[PDB]
Amino acid sequence: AVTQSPRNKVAVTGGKVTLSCQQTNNHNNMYWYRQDTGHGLRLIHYSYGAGSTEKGDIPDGYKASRPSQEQFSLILELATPSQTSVYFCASGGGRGSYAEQFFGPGTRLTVLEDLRQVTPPKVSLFEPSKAEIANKQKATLVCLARGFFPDHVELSWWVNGKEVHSGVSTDPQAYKESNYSYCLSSRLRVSATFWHNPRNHFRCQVQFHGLSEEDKWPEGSPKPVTQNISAEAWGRAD
Amino acid sequence: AVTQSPRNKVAVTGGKVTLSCQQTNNHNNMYWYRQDTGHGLRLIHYSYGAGSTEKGDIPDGYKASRPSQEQFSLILELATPSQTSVYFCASGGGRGSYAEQFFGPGTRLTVLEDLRQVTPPKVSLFEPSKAEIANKQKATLVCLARGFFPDHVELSWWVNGKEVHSGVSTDPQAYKESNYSYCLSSRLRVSATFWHNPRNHFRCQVQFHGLSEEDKWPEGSPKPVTQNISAEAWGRAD
Amino acid sequence: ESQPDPMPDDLHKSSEFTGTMGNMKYLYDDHYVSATKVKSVDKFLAHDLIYNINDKKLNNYDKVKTELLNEDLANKYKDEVVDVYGSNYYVNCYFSSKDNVGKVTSGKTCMYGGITKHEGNHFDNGNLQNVLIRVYENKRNTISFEVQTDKKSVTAQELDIKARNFLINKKNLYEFNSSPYETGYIKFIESNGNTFWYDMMPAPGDKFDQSKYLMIYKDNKMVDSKSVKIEVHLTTKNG
Amino acid sequence: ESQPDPMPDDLHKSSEFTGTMGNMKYLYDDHYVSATKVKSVDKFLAHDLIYNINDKKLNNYDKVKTELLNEDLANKYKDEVVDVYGSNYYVNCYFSSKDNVGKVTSGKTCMYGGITKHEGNHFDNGNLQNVLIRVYENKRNTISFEVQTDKKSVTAQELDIKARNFLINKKNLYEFNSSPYETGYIKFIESNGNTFWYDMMPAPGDKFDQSKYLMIYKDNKMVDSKSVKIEVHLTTKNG
């Protein structure tokens, strides 16, 4: 395996962040990459063995450490907006030799100005209108989670209490509907008769990730403890 | 698995190239990336199933096809210098989800002006001089393959007929010693007494890859049929 | 005598589709499922029948699932020896409940409609009904052509596929990334004046849901090949 | 009375090293292997002994391999109860022939020299010999300090490590990516005037071969702690 931690982080500018990566494969090398929307998977720092850490394509701003053979940790001393990206750690074979690397889950890090911008989302269910297009249906149900920040959310669908994966069409990525607001929308298409069975339940649950236990909230307003939101509805008679 | 083919290609500008990728994992998705020195691993095109091919970060110039579920092939219609890079194909899980992708070996493609520039390399063995530095030895043996083009070479070391991997220090990548010349150098360090046993053999073999069987050589000069070069030497008395 | 001709702003514009047009072309360029005298063998969801039909062209599948607008239509052909023709797809082709987004399996394909009874539907002396197709590029008849077929009662789908395939090659109706035309509707006109057209351009957006498009054939609309008139209409961004 | 002091252009410049200096710092900042009354237990290649020494600090290893300049020196301590001290490394730490570039194994480390006999080498009443270390930053004595040690006969290595560790913290001798100093040689001077210095800055290049550097301790040079003078010399790119 190749674990990662934290798996989501909201840090403020000027703060020092640290992301760890463990590797139960006994590999020599470890790599600290950062995938950026628009750009690709880029190499920041890597190491050929415990007690060595070479600069990769983009080292600037980051330090790294290979204190043990199992651990490699990328350090952000003066976290800035610029480091807002998704960090992938890879264990395994040699640099530039992807066929032998074992990637980690990925850490989503957003370095914002002030933590009072983190807002959980609103989630709603809608029905489109076939009459609006010449083509068919345009998706049975519409889940629209919006007005959230930062995008550390995972949308899901649950019919009759089970998470489905068939007929769902969640947007590839959250769209910044404003400088400090994100919009997301999945579309679950079912059989009309199914949507017309009043006994059938439909749940669009969005996972929000915000201020972690280690993040001290500035005294003055209630702190976003929120985790999992959802919009539900049932079948509308046929 | 996730094979690739060809695994090395010298094509001229204006030519149409095609690189295939097979996947015996029965994955839905397939991706066609290109790793570039200085830049990262970038996504060109990908596909969610047979008969679909979406544009990735950098689609320009490339076409792709997902004719079967097992095959995805990137097409370069008007191969140009710009497409000189290393193509990685990945099967597996979702876009941007590296933890589930299975990378392929990689295809090295160089799109040069005219095939008469492809030159096999010269390979030599040397001994550095400890007296040149305040530190120790500076590597027992020096292999220096130079004057080659394009860089489709793989250096190796063979002591007493066996390929060794311990004590070898081959440069990370071939250096362009000129616009149409590449230099490479590995350093195999052994025990002095070992280097002094006249019975011990040392072989620095470089693998050159050039004009493939499908490349018609312009009539006028001998065609580089060369494949594997090597420089050998034995132990120098103690 | 049924569907009103398309208003200019009712039709799709290819320049409003910022995706890989070649996903549209996949459907038409020499791509289809063909069957003769095949009986339904299974059913996933009511309105859909599953047939044992192998991929003669490239051994990709051995099963085909055609979905019809209603179970009434499914139940109709359930035990009827028929013929099958239409463009099949893969992304989003599910036969079982335990199949997540993105058809993970192999050996099976999907489609809509394309069924016609086999009994006496084929020509008395083994002839091929020719269907004339007139082309209008920018309100000007530029070219015309016929499309053969061994059936008295074909499906508009079959003709539309066959119609388009021809154009992909002759007029480059769909390029790999784009198309020379801005719009294109194939008007169907039967003997009784009944008219029904279809839109060849992908709905403006950055995606092309092949399974969503192919539903234009969900009804299984069939037409008398020996008397039907087909008019392919096209337009170009300038003239 | 042996090694001539370094000519200004004989020493290394940190600004000529375009790598991660923090690989140099790893060696000195609170990093070493320590042993007391340990017997050699194996041998890989003649000039090297292997000892059963566990990583008390962070359970990283349980074996240590120290290489000496010649088998004569190895064979010497082979069956001698000794003490072990010195900075150990990992990248390029091979114990077996079947170990490729990049120490793939775990539970073992490497090093050079650092051996001293244990017999009567430790102070009569359990005292710690203090060793004064004078610092010259740009030809000016700026600071001085002592470094304790439970041995009459220590290794210059031990003192150099201990010497440098102190500086990493007080003078930031080695930062993670750079260093405030341009050059730095630690001059050793014994009772008999014998002089031998070492260079703290990484050889100009874009790499730091930790295993290559640590060979400065291959000989196992030992010194009388009670009478030896150590002078750390440094320089800064300006003044």
Report which of C189, C182, C149 is spatially closest to residue C165, judged by C-alpha positions.
Answer: C149
Are C101 and A166 an interchain contact pair (Cβ–Cβ within 8 Å)? yes
A:108-147 residues touching chain C, CB 8 A cutoff:
133-137
E strand residue ranges, D33-121: 33-38, 40-43, 48-51, 61-67, 82-86, 107-112, 115-117
Q: How far is D177 from chain A (nearest CA, A)?
A: 8
Q: Is B168 on the interface with D (CB under 8 A)?
A: yes
Are A106 and B99 an interchain contact pair (Cβ–Cβ within 8 Å)? yes
Which residues on adjacent β-strands are paired with residue D90?
none
When CB atoms are compared, the residue of C91, C176, C177 closest to B52 is C91
Which residues of chain B lie closer than 8 angstroms to D203, CB-CB? 133, 135
d(CA D151, CA D83): 10
Q: Dihedral, CA atoms, D139, D145, D148, D152, nearest 10 degrees?
A: 40
d(CA C8, CA C17): 17
d(CA A178, CA C7): 36
Are A166 and C218 an interchain contact pair (Cβ–Cβ within 8 Å)? no
Q: How far is B124 from chain D (nearest CA, A)?
A: 22
Q: A1-113: which CATH topology?
A: Immunoglobulin-like (2.60.40)
d(CA D207, CA B123): 24
First to last CA, chain D: 30
Are C212 and A135 an interchain contact pair (Cβ–Cβ within 8 Å)? yes
Are C101 and A133 an interchain contact pair (Cβ–Cβ within 8 Å)? no
Are C22 and B59 an interchain contact pair (Cβ–Cβ within 8 Å)? no
Q: Is B26 left (phi over 0), alpha (psi -120 to 50) or beta?
A: left
Q: Is A86 on the interface with D (CB under 8 A)?
A: no
Residues 6+ apart with CB under 8 A from B54: B45, B46, B47, B48, C19, C20, C23
Compute the Cα dihedral for B145, B146, B147, B152 and give only its sign: positive
Q: Is C55 annotated as contributing to ligand binding?
A: no
Q: Is C233 annotated as contributing to ligand binding?
A: no
Site of tokens 């069957």: C35
Q: How far is C152 from chain A (nearest CA, A)?
A: 28
State the chains in contact with B (3 or more Cβ–Cβ pairs under 8 Å).
A, C, D
Which residues of chain B lie closer than 8 angstroms to A86, CB-CB? 96
d(CA B101, CA D215): 43
d(CA B2, CA D40): 49
Are B39 and A35 an interchain contact pair (Cβ–Cβ within 8 Å)? no
d(CA C175, CA C58): 23
**What are the b/e assignments for C204-223, b being 16+ CB within 10 Å?**
eeeebbbbbbbbbbbbbebb
Report which of C106, C167, C100 is spatially closest to residue C137, judged by C-alpha positions.
Answer: C167
CA B104 and chain centroid, separation: 13
Are C101 and A165 an interchain contact pair (Cβ–Cβ within 8 Å)? yes
Are A191 and C45 an interchain contact pair (Cβ–Cβ within 8 Å)? yes
d(CA B99, CA B94): 9
User: What domains appear along chain D, each with residue ranges and CATH number?
Assistant: 1-31+120-237 (3.10.20.120), 32-119 (2.40.50.110)
Q: Which amino acid is at A225?
A: V
State the chains in contact with C (3 or more Cβ–Cβ pairs under 8 Å).
A, B
When CB atoms are compared, the residue of A134, A168, A193 closest to C101 is A168
Nearest residue in chain B measured CA to CA from A38 = B57
Judged by 3 or more CB pairs under 8 A, whether D touches C is no
Would the CATH topology of B1-113 be identical to that of B114-238?
yes
Query: What six digits make up the tokens of C37?
Result: 């005298």
Q: Is A162 on the interface with C (CB under 8 A)?
A: no
Degrees, nearest 5: CA angle B204-B206-B210: 165
State the chains in contact with A (3 or more Cβ–Cβ pairs under 8 Å).
B, C, D
d(CA B9, CA C24): 32
Domain A114-238 CATH assignment equals 2.60.40.10: yes
Nearest residue in chain B measured CA to CA from C58 = B68
Query: What six digits make up the tokens of C111?
Result: 């489609």
Are C91 and B51 an interchain contact pair (Cβ–Cβ within 8 Å)? yes
Nearest residue in chain C measured CA to CA from A187 = C101
Domain map of chain B by residue range? 1-113, 114-238
Which residues of chain A lie closer than 8 angstroms to C100, CB-CB? 165-166
Q: Is B92 on the interface with A (CB under 8 A)?
A: no
Tell which of A3, A57, A87, A98 to mutate to test the B interface (max B CBs under 10 Å): A98
Which residues of chain D lie closer than 8 angstroms to A68, CB-CB? 58, 60
Q: Tell me the resolution in Å.
A: 3.5
Helix (H, G, I), strand (E, B) or coil at B95: coil
Nearest residue in chain B measured CA to CA from D47 = B191
Which residues of chain B lie closer than 8 angstroms to A88, CB-CB? 98-99
Q: Is A166 on the interface with C (CB under 8 A)?
A: yes
Convert C182-234 into a string of H (helix), E (strand) and C (coil). Answer: CEEEEEEECCCCCEEEEECCCCCECCCCHHHHHHHHCCCCEEECCCCEEEEEE
Q: What is the DSSP letter of A99?
A: G
Are A40 and B38 an interchain contact pair (Cβ–Cβ within 8 Å)? no
Residue D89 burial (C-beta neighbours within 10 Å; 0-12, 13-18, 19+): buried
Length of chain A: 238
Q: Is B99 on the interface with D (CB under 8 A)?
A: no
Which secondary structure element, helix H or strand E, spans residue C162, and what is its range? Answer: helix C156-170
Which secondary structure element, helix H or strand E, spans residue D74, and what is its range? Answer: helix D71-77
d(CA A87, CA B176): 32
Q: Which amino acid is at B168?
A: V
d(CA D134, CA D138): 13
Which residues of chain B lie closer than 8 angstroms to D7, CB-CB? none
Q: Is C124 annotated as contributing to ligand binding?
A: no
Other Cβ atoms less than 10 A from the Cβ of A81: the count is 10
Q: Which amino acid is at D18?
A: T
Which secondary structure element, helix H or strand E, spans residue D95, and what is its range? Answer: none
Which residues of chain B lie closer than 8 angstroms to A101, CB-CB? 103
Q: Is A54 on the interface with D (CB under 8 A)?
A: yes
Which secondary structure element, helix H or strand E, spans residue C73, and what is its range? Answer: helix C71-77
Nearest residue in chain A measured CA to CA from D61 = A68
- B226 touches B211 (CB < 8 A): no
Q: How far is B169 from chain D (nearest CA, A)?
A: 8
Are A41 and B105 an interchain contact pair (Cβ–Cβ within 8 Å)? no
Are D101 and B136 an interchain contact pair (Cβ–Cβ within 8 Å)? no
Which residues of chain C lie closer than 8 angstroms to A193, CB-CB? 46
**C75 backbone dihedrals φ, ψ, rounded to 5°:** -50, -30
Which residues of chain B lie closer than 8 angstroms to A97, CB-CB? 106
d(CA A78, CA A87): 16
**What are the b/e assignments for C54-86, b being 16+ CB within 10 Å?**
ebeeeebbebbbbbbbeeebbeebeeeebbbbb
Residues 6+ apart with CB under 8 A from A141: A125, A126, A127, A187, A188, A189, A190, A195, A202, A204, A233
Nearest residue in chain A measured CA to CA from C44 = A191
Q: Dihedral, CA atoms, D174, D177, D181, D182, nearest 10 degrees?
A: 130
**What are the b/e assignments for B132-170, b being 16+ CB within 10 Å?**
eebbbebbbbbbbbbebbbbbbebbbbbeeeebebbbbb
d(CA B13, CA D174): 50
Which residues on adjacent β-strands are paired with residue C136?
C141, C233
Interface of C with B (CB under 8 A): 19-20, 22-23, 26, 31, 58, 60, 89-93, 102-104, 106, 176-177, 210
Helix (H, G, I), strand (E, B) or coil at D212: helix
Q: Is B95 on the interface with A (CB under 8 A)?
A: yes
When CB atoms are compared, the residue of B26, B29, B50 closest to C60 is B50
Site of tokens 């010449």: A134
Are C203 and A135 an interchain contact pair (Cβ–Cβ within 8 Å)? yes
Q: Is A14 left (phi over 0), alpha (psi -120 to 50) or beta?
A: left
